[model samples]
Target: QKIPVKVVTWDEIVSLSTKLAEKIKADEYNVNVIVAIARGGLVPARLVADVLGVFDILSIKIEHWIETASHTPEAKVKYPFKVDLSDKNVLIIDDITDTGDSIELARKYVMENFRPTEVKTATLQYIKPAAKIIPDYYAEEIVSWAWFMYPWNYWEDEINLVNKILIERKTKDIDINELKRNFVESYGIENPPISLDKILTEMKRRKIV
Candidate 1:
């Protein structure tokens, strides 16, 4: 099966967050707290929180995509609730919602445990057709199942993809130029953002090859 890839630049993410913040402010939801769904949501959450001028930012860790775990693993919160969100209007933020399972689970958990007066979801990117739950506000809407490569995860993601391709091709030797070309042509990666020499150096430094 072939999946499309989407490369989201840092500027685009920041702009999206700014737009989300503007919407939230305009809607006037009286949000008292901002809860970020950790790992992917951290950056966007912080960006939104800063723009909205809401200081009470909290994060909930959810385990969904385990590097070594089986594919399609169950998504669950990793910790017990400790924050009192009673009567507070909550704004939940995330980077992107693909299947929306994780975000849905997070919303359910917050509602059941914290009892927030209201909960609104926001995301930088939302894949509408695939999402079980749609975010209240989203900057971009995607119609396909594309592997989104955010700026924050660029290097690591590129390295991983390079390694996977090398393994799949069953070749020990790699040409950096060819790799860059393939990444752009096949993965739809834009800008050739990171330096090819740097990527090669990092891979060798970490003994990834």
Candidate 2:
């Protein structure tokens, strides 16, 4: 079965982030600290922090996804808490809540270890239908099981796709132009932020091709 892919543009991402910030503001949650779940939550957390005028931003590394699997074999925190979250209103931010294990694990860890006053989860996209847990605040609700391709990981994913196609075809004679066209067609991406040449150059530099 082919899973649907949604490629979000830079502009769209910024807009979504702005909307999420507004949602946070409207709720009147007194957020003392923002904990970004790396690496997907980093950007959205920063954006929300900027809007909420909260500079006390911290990050907690939670390893949930290995490659493209639906669930991690075991979800664990990669690093200990950086800052003291004692009795503070903490807002947890992430890019998307898919199976909800990552955010749930993060929330549980903070509540259990640091003993924060309150912990709430926020995400740009929330997959409510598939997620075991739902976020407190979300910009969009995704009912279907579609993969979201964000701008931050655009080039890396495309390069990986190209490599996979090459391996399947059993040929190193890959046409860069054809690859670009196929990517655009498959992902429904128009006006990609990164150029095809740059992606190819990166692939060569990384010896992925």
Candidate 3:
């Protein structure tokens, strides 16, 4: 199925996560544990935990890699990691749920192992139409499996590699203008898509910021 991709910039994602935290806190939900799906979910979980004054953080790291292609779908952990979630209310946070494989597995794992009083899942960005499982909370609806533009793991390497290539374009002497042009061309990021102003306004409307 073809999906329409919506790229959420780092700033917009952060702002959405902040708003999500406020929403969770404002409600009377007794979230005793904040369980974050490792890697991508860590940032939002950290910020939410800080905002909610929650100290206990649990992480579930799932390895979904084959031999070579890292991001592409391959063998994933059916059940990975260990957590003592018995009878505690859990708020599971994830970055995005594509194909619903990971999130479904996580939810099932939690249900089987933790037997928590309640389990709620949240995602920052939801790519609708393709998501098999619906997140309890999400900021925006994305239609395509777009490459999320947030800066995270390996982003620096990509940036540096682009910089190196751009330097080569400068006829032996890298000029500032050439560097700028090459950098933009290499990254292909003309402008960061997120409008911080709009996000802030949304946050304020939700009484998050």
Candidate 2 weakest lDDT stretch, 10 residues: 64-73
Clashes of each: 0, 0, 1
Give candidate 2's error at residue 71 in angstroms.
Answer: 8.1
- Indicate the residue-level lDDT of 156 in model 3: 33
68-183 per-residue lDDT for model 2 (tens digits)? 56643567899675456787999999999898888889899888877789999999998878899999999988888788878898887667655654566536776876777666
Which model is ahead, 1 or 3, in terms of lDDT? 1
lDDT of 3 by residue, 1-209 (tens): 12222345567767888888777777767788988887778888887788777788888776676556555575255446566778789888888766667777677777877678898888777888788788877766778566565555334333433335544463544454554454455555444343333433444566543
Q: How would you encode candidate 1's per-residue C-alpha lDDT over 19-82 as one tens digit per residue? A: 9888888988787888899888999998998898888888899987554655655788998676
For model 2, what is the alpha-carbon lDDT of residue 153? 84
TM-scores for candidates 1 onward, in order: 0.87, 0.87, 0.66
Model 2 stretches with alpha carbons more than 4 Å out: 1-3, 65-72
For all candidates in order, the CA lDDT equals 0.82, 0.82, 0.66
Prediction 1 TM-score vs. true: 0.87
Model 1's lDDT to the true fold? 0.82
